[PDB]
Structure formats: C-alpha cells, structure tokens
Design a protein around this nucleic acid. Structure first.
Ligand code: MG
Ligand code: MG
Ligand code: MG
Ligand code: MG
Ligand code: MG
Ligand code: MG
Ligand code: MG
Ligand code: MG
Ligand code: MG
Ligand code: MG
Ligand code: MG
Ligand code: MG
Ligand code: MG
Ligand code: MG
Ligand code: MG
Lengths: 152, 83, 114, 100, 99, 127
RNA sequence: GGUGGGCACUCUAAGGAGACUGCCGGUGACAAACCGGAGGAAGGUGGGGAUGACGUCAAGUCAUCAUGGCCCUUACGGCCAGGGCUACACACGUGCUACAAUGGUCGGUACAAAGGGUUGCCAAGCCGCGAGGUGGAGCUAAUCCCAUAAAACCGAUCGUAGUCCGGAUCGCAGUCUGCAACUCGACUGCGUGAAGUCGGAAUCGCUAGUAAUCGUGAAUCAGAAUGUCACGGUGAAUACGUU
C-alpha cells in the first residue's frame, strides 16, 4: 500500500527433499491449516510420478513449472470510454507463484479419483506441455501480444 | 413427557369432582380451567368444559384419548385464514 | 435376492435398504446369526441367505410398517387433538417456527396473490 | 419496577422461606425408590396441597435498589446500570477497570 | 508446626501484613519458611453501559484475589493470637491451622 | 559436566539437558520417533545440531510441558540452542545468523468486544 | 515424585534490570530528521488493550433511575386462574449445518490454555444400548470435583452414487428439572429418511500467529444457546503500486 512498510516473511522447512519450491507448493495446496495433509498429498503425487515412469519427480516438477510460468501479463487501465489492456513483463518472483497457483487450481478440477492422482496427472501433462494450464498460459500470451500497440 | 416415576398428573379439585360425579351418570359438563390435567382411564363417557382462554368448550371422553391432555382439545389460537 | 435387495454391496449396507431396518438393526441381524458383514451378499450361500430371511421376518418390513404408521397418522387425524389439527394443515407439529422457515412441511414458496 | 412488583415479589420469598423445609421431605419421599406408591401418592397430594406461590422456581430476583428483572449479577446484588455507578465511584471493593 | 494463610484484594497491605507477621515470627525465636506466592484468582465481568440499545457499548471490570502461605517451626510465645486485632486490620483475611 | 537450557515457544516450555553420549534423545521418558510421528518436527528439532555439526557427540534429555506439537518442537529447538551456547560459548554468530536464539514472541490475539474473532466482523449491511 | 529428601530448574507473584536513535556508516540547510550496520530476546511509538479534544446529528433512552408540566383516583391503582408475546399466503437482516474422496465410518494412540464449585461440585463401585438411576468419598480448593480436549498421526473399508454424503421432517418408546413440559423445554433409543451437485443481478471480512479450520470455559440460569463474552491447537496467500 501507500506506506511500503511490510517486508517479506521467510519460512524454509522442507522435511524430506530439502527444496524451497516444494515447501511453497505445499503452502499453495494447503487449505484450512492442514500442513500435514498437504505434505501427504504432495508426496503421494510425487511417488505416483516416480512409479509411472523412470523420470525422477523433482526434475519433472521443476521443468513443469518452467513450462508453465508466463512471460507477460495483461493489466487494465481506463481512459474514459474504453479500458485498454496493457502488457507488462511479469517480475521474476511473480511468475513462480502464478505458475503454482494455476497448477493447483487446474489440478483441483482435473476430474479423476484423488487429489494426489490429480496432481500426478497435471505434472505429467505439464512436463510435456499439453494440459489446460498451458492452454491458459498461451491464451494469456496471445492476449498480451494482441495488445502490443499500447506496451509503452 | 412426564417421568414414569409418577405417571399420572391430575389436579386435586378436578380429580375429586370427577370421582364424585361418577355416582350420578353424565348429565352436565364439568367446567374447569386445568388444561394441564391428563384424562384418567376411569372417567370415560363424561363431558368436560375446558377453558379455552375466553370461554369453556365441551369435550366428550372416549377410550382413544386417555393418555392425552385436556388442553389438546381446546385450540387457543384461531387463524381463520389469511385470505 | 430378498425383496429386490441390492447386490455387490456389504451385507449390513445392503440390509439397510428394507424400510424398517437401519444401521444398528442390520448389524444386529448380521450378529445374531453368524455372518461377516464385510462379505458382499453377492457371495453369500443360500443356506445363510434364508437365515437372514428368517432374521428379517421377525420384526417388520414395508407393507405392515407403512400400514401401522398410516393408522397412527389417521388416528391422530380423526381424534381432533391439537396434534391432529396441526397435522392436517400440513404444518410442523412439534412447535417449530411458522413465521419463517417452515419450508419442509410447506413445500414450494408459492408467492402471494398477484 | 413498580411498588406493587417489589412488594409482591418480597411476599414471594417470605412465603417460600415460610415452609422451606416440608418441600424437602415431600420431594425426598416422592423421589425415594424404596418408598412405594401407597405413601408416595400421599406425599404427592401433600405437595400439591401447599399454595402455588411457594416454590423456589417462581422467585425471579430483581435489583436490590431498583427492582429491575433484566441485567443481574449474582456476585453482587445489583443490576447492570447500578453496578457501574457503584464501581466507578469506588464503592465496590476490589473492582477496577481491566485491560489484560 | 502451624499454617498461616492470607487473602486480599490488593498486594500492598497483604505484603505488609506478611512481612510484619514473619518478623514477629522471628522475634519469638521460631524458624520460618518463606512466603509462598499462590496463584491469584482473576474474575472478570462485561457490562453494558447504555440505558437502552447499544450492544457494542460495553465496559469490562475485574477482581483480583491474592493469596499467601506461611509456616513456622518450634514456637513458644504466641502473641500473634494476642495481637490478632492488630495483625489484621482492614482488608486482609487470615487463617490459622494446627495451632 | 553437562549443560542446561530452557526453551519457550507458543506457551510451550521445555527443559533440555546436554550430556556426553551418542544422541540417545529422550523426551518425557519415551523416544523421539514415538513422540513426533512422521512430520517435520524431527528435522526442525534436529537442525541446531547439524548447523554446528555435533549431532553424534551429544546425548540430549528433554522434558516438555504445554502447547501443541509445533510449539513443543520450537521450544525444544530454542532450548537446545541456548544450552549449546552455554556449552561452547563461541558459536553465537552461527545460531544468530540462522535465527535460532531469537525467541519468537507471537501469541494468540485476544478476542475483542464487538468482534467475532480477533479481527473478524459481522457483514455490515448498509440498508 | 509413591517415600525420604533437595532448593538445581519449571511454575507461581512481588520487587528490579532492559530498548533511549543508545554506538558506527551515509544523506541532510554539518537543524529536525531519513536509509543502513553491529550488539541484543526484543530497533526505531517491539505486539495487543485502556484512555474518545471543542462540537455535530432538537441522534437514543420519561421503560433502570431521577425529574417540570399534563392526565386517572370504585380506575390508566391493585390480587388471582387461564391464554398471548412461540400465530403465518409472504419480504428482509444476522448465523449454524451441508452439498463430499484435502472426505464419511470402525479400531489404536499424542499434545493445551483459561475458568467454576459448601442452599455447591457431586467422585470410586453397581444397574441400564443410551439419556440417566443408586451410592457416598474428597474438596471453603496449585490438594478433591467439573474433566477423556478436538482437528492431527497410524491400520482397514467405502470408489463418485443423491451414495456408508446430507441431516430436515415424521411415527413409537423414554430420562431429567420443575406444583405443573398440550399450546410451549432440553436430551436418549428405534425406524423414516426431505431439499441440497458450490449458488443470477448484486455484495461482505481480512495485512501474520492474521484470515481459515478445531475444540474448551463462563455470565444469565430450577430446566432451556447455532447468541454474547473469553481461552487455547493447527496455521496460509498476497501487497508492483496510487492512474
Ligand atoms: Mg415508583
Ligand atoms: Mg427464572
Ligand atoms: Mg540481528
Ligand atoms: Mg491471552
Ligand atoms: Mg448486503
Ligand atoms: Mg529502516
Ligand atoms: Mg538493526
Ligand atoms: Mg468508550
Ligand atoms: Mg427529534
Ligand atoms: Mg424516537
Ligand atoms: Mg397469570
Ligand atoms: Mg420476542
Ligand atoms: Mg451419516
Ligand atoms: Mg491494517
Ligand atoms: Mg483460536
């Protein structure tokens, strides 16, 4: 807000893989304060990924995020009769959080049996870049480039 | 429901009036204000004018109302229909 | 078998479907005569299916239960007590609100005049 | 908070304290398992013989200064809007404004 | 072996009373074990402050009850009973046991 | 010999004794794995040892009271940090950099008058 | 810690210490001040509370109380028995419970804080499926009672169905308080099993131990809380910025 007074809060507590991104994803998949349930869900999804194929789950997860984080975003501004949607390069910190949120959001509506399996399926699909999340990402990019006349 | 440690509840005056009136069989409704009272099995066939809230309405006692209470046979609110 | 009992289900859960036996009653039936409620009735021998039939034929099922319930309802209906009068207008008979929120006994919303 | 209200409620606790003991053994006889109905019914009719305005459950306590039915605190004897007056003047011992 | 219990609504005068009883306890030459601070009760009330409808208009009060425990060994001269009038004056409640 | 430490976190208090040994680890006369069952509590309680890399050298005796699982774990970590400082008083810098000796003073905010939770409010219909 | 015992600790509650831009670097009208760093449990009024300037809205209260005038004085004053404030074609405000698989049941086990109790709490044992009943111990309470915390963790099952989801409504049989549970109490057992598949226009709270979720206590009170006031367990996302 106007003050610019609140600095960031750092918590880094990966229990069995020693990765910060995994802990942040556990934060994203959490609901109503269930830390341990989220850890179980994430570990089950990674174990399903490990069992399905020879690929190790951590690298698959990381390169699935790298194939889903958007590059530019659309932000609206009115001028008194029309609101134009200018593109802005997403900050290096925003892209990771946006990717995680999109991944978990489209995992929640995947439609198959359990949340662990839904995450597993989404990670497998995103590692190759064919899920609904990558469709959303490319939609965002095409919308942003279609409004490149404003850019500034 | 009343505890079965004391099943029957009956007002003393109404009880004695009914159990006195049994000698001369049903000839006039017994007017009363005690809706809390429960029908005794031994008073069947006699008519009781129970208080409604402004007047006393008459009820005739058969076997299928022994375990109930007097107040259930005198409705206190009217509601003759909204329209 | 039974009266259109649903198969491919655990014994107690399927037994629940008989309108007069719930969950404690179904497991009581399963316990009175030795059967495993973990076993699907699809896999139970007739020599014990008829045993469950004998156990179920002891209390009440379907037609007689509805008959006695309706007899009680009609008795209340025709006595003329407050319960009967409240029970013939299609209104809650146990003292709940009627100013608002008595929708399960009053069905749809059904507006007001025009 | 009329005068009649206070007077009649005062008469109520006076009448309750009048007997205040026969209720005890009457209810004990009613509630006693090894009592038999023969004398338990007699205790019932004896209990119902007493005036109706004698039970403890008919006592509705009011403010000792205004006779107000609502807003009562039983640690003190006063109501909602006189306890504040007594406390803020320092009359009530031990009571202070608390933050914690 | 006697037991001494003190209660008060505030700590100034109960501390003073504890100090004076314990110094009188040394005076007779009896051993003493120090003052035990017991947990203090705290009872709270919330009261509406308007004569009519304002529910969030509330004021909150509390009462604190302080306790202290003392005991002595080998007594011979008991003027504490003979000074009971002076020992407790205004707002200190004193209990004695096993005299 | 031996060293003492006390830890406090989220109304959870912990007494920690450091002795020479081979990391027996006892909490309320029962084992660590039997105390914290398959969660991050083991790593978070273990960190102040590998940060100073003396996990094998020290046997640890622990008594705990109050709070929940996470508060208990944080209190144990704080107590072990303090005792370890009391043992080898030159490694203050490492634990300060890790932010281990800093006692977190966050507590449960008191409920307010006119509010449901500490900050939640009714819905404020304006008409 | 059952005992002797100790006064280490924890804790309890009184007295004190500590954080004040104090020291260093830079910016600054070598002023106030601003941005950093060290030390430290805490750094920039550390966190939370209480405390509401002159006045405004002829704001609210004559029904807590007090008070000027007016009004009733065989009634607008009193006592009693019943009924009503609990009605019900409908509209609105505030909440609880759900619509499930981050879940529902069955079994095993771990960890709190605050508080109430001698016209009171009301144990152990025994009897009931259960509400509950007998019993009488201890406690004027850091001692006895309320009084097993729940979510979490471990194992099995249910496999996407209006269902082992959801519990409304209704029938039968009961317990307790109370002179008295019909109008019109709260809980228990058996059966029944409704709408509900995440909600149009619109709209609300929240910046960290916060929101979200899980339990516990108290006042009022014979009996009667999804309300109010409090206590802890687990425990986030986001803030580029001021068009
Ligand atoms: Mg007057
Ligand atoms: Mg009352
Ligand atoms: Mg520092
Ligand atoms: Mg607090
Ligand atoms: Mg609104
Ligand atoms: Mg700064
Ligand atoms: Mg600093
Ligand atoms: Mg104020
Ligand atoms: Mg006006
Ligand atoms: Mg007005
Ligand atoms: Mg009356
Ligand atoms: Mg009302
Ligand atoms: Mg169910
Ligand atoms: Mg704010
Ligand atoms: Mg809380």
């Amino acid at each position: 807000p106007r003050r610019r007074v609140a600095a960031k809060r750092e918590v880094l507590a990966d229990p069995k893989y020693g990765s910060q991104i995994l802990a942040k994803f556990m934060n994203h998949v959490m609901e109503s304060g269930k830390k341990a349930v989220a850890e179980r869900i994430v570990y089950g999804a990674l174990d399903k990924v490990k069992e399905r194929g020879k690929a190790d789950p951590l690298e698959t997860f990381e390169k699935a995020l790298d194939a889903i984080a958007p590059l530019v975003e659309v932000k609206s501004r009115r001028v008194g009769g029309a609101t134009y949607q200018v593109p802005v390069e997403v900050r290096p910190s925003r892209r990771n959080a946006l990717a995680m949120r999109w991944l978990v959001d489209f995992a929640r509506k995947r439609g198959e049996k359990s949340m662990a399996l839904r995450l597993a399926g989404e990670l497998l699909d995103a590692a190759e870049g064919k899920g609904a999340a990558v469709k959303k990402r490319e939609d965002v990019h095409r919308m942003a480039e279609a409004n490149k006349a404003f850019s500034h | 429901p009343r505890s079965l440690k004391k099943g029957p509840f009956i007002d003393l005056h109404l009880l004695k009036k009914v159990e006195v009136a049994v000698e001369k069989n049903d000839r006039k409704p017994i007017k009363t204000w005690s809706r809390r009272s429960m029908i005794l099995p031994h008073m069947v066939g006699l008519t009781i004018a129970v208080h409604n809230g402004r007047q006393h309405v008459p009820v005739l006692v058969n076997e299928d109302m022994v375990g109930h209470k007097l107040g259930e046979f005198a409705a206190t609110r009217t509601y003759r229909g909204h329209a | 078998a039974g009266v259109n009992i649903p198969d491919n289900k655990h014994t107690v859960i399927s037994l629940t479907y008989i309108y007069g036996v719930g969950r404690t009653t179904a497991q009581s039936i399963c316990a009175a005569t030795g059967v495993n409620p973990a076993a699907k009735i699809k896999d139970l021998s007739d020599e014990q299916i008829d045993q469950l039939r004998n156990e179920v034929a002891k209390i009440t099922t379907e037609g007689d239960l509805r008959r006695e319930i309706n007899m009680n309802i009609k008795r209340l209906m025709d006595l003329g007590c407050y319960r009967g009068l409240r029970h013939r207008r299609g209104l809650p008979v146990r003292g709940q609100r009627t100013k608002t929120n008595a929708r399960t006994r009053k069905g749809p919303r059904k507006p007001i005049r025009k | 908070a009329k005068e009649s209200m206070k007077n009649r409620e005062l008469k109520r606790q006076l009448t309750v304290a009048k007997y205040a003991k026969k209720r005890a053994e009457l209810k004990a006889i009613i509630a006693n398992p090894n009592s038999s109905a023969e004398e338990r019914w007699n205790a019932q009719v004896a209990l119902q013989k007493q005036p109706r305005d004698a039970s403890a459950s008919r006592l509705r306590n009011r403010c000792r200064l205004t006779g107000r039915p609502h807003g009562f605190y039983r640690k003190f004897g006063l109501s909602r809007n006189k306890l504040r007056e007594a406390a803020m003047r320092g009359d009530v011992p031990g009571l202070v404004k608390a933050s914690w | 072996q006697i037991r001494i219990r003190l209660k008060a609504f505030d700590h100034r005068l109960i501390d003073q009373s504890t100090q004076e009883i314990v110094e009188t306890a040394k005076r007779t030459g009896a051993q003493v074990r120090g003052p035990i601070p017991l947990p203090t009760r705290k009872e709270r009330f919330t009261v509406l402050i308007s004569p009519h409808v304002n529910k969030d208009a509330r004021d909150q009060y509390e009462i604190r009850t302080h306790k202290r425990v003392l005991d002595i060994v080998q007594p011979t001269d008991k003027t504490v009973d003979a000074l009971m009038k002076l020992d407790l004056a205004a707002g200190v409640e004193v209990q004695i046991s096993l005299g | 010999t031996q060293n003492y430490g006390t830890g406090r976190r989220k109304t959870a208090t912990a007494r920690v004794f450091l002795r020479p040994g081979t990391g027996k680890i006892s909490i309320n006369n029962r084992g660590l794995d039997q105390f914290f069952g398959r969660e991050t509590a083991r790593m978070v309680v273990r960190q102040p040892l590998e940060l100073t890399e003396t996990v094998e050298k020290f046997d640890i005796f622990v008594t705990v009271v109050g709070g929940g699982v996470s508060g208990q774990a944080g209190a144990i970590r704080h107590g072990i940090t303090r005792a370890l400082i009391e043992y080898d008083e030159t490694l203050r810098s490492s634990l300060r950099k890790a932010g281990y000796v800093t006692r977190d003073a966050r507590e449960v905010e008191r409920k307010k008058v006119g509010l449901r939770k500490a900050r939640k409010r009714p819905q404020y219909s304006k008409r």
